[PDB]
Symmetry: C3
């Protein structure tokens, strides 16, 4: 292939998220890096799907609920930031307190 470091980081995220979601479908509450991976992949998928920055923000609040992660993970995650390519280019997407 010919992956930039940024592109590879993006794939890692997709791979960590699939691993995470498999664990979620087995009934395991997610840890902090697993949650970050799931939420980050959600931003990447959104931008890939043509979603706007705002629709990605809007939707991301509903991806993991407090009950889906281990105790303490929500206060470990006041902010996630992910760069994704939207229709006008590369943008840093901010998810504030995504998990409640």
């Amino acid at each position: 292939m010919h992956l930039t470091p940024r592109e590879f980081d993006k794939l890692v995220i997709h791979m960590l998220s699939d691993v995470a979601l498999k664990r979620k479908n087995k009934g395991l509450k997610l840890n902090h890096p697993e949650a970050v991976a799931v939420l980050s992949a959600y931003v990447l998928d959104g931008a890939r799907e043509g979603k706007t920055v705002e629709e990605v923000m809007d939707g991301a609040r509903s991806v993991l609920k407090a009950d889906d992660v281990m105790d303490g993970v929500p206060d470990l995650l006041p902010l996630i930031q992910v760069e994704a390519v939207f229709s006008d280019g590369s943008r840093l997407v901010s998810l504030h307190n995504p998990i409640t």
Copy 2:
């Protein structure tokens, strides 16, 4: 588990392929590097399954049609070349104009 650089590259092709096929599954037209991953993983899988070079070449032509990829992708893709191990060792597989 020690992977050689070439083996790691093969893993990266399979994982990029998997991400691209998930997108196709959702009805999204594939971009250029996505199409390259899917066709490249096809060759690797073909070789792994004991198909001949010629069988993989024949098979690869129907993997992705023009409607499966974004406008412009077919003429962005006159040639894909993928090294894979066949029953007589490493071979450089050339896919000519695979997306029509």
Copy 3:
């Protein structure tokens, strides 16, 4: 990811690839078998199994019929570092494929 963390991701991704091949009815090769059994150790530890339950379950993950001829004797030992409840542990699988 730390190098060790990245190694574990690589193990999961090689195992997924090996399992898809198993589902196609292909006999696994040696490194495919290693990835499957290693990912199994990693999964059991993450699920909260003890080292002993992981060892006990591991012997039944791949049978001789699931792997190419010669693979069992190429595999007298797998060792996998995994994080259990009291920290990092080196799990040994002795003769896992019979």
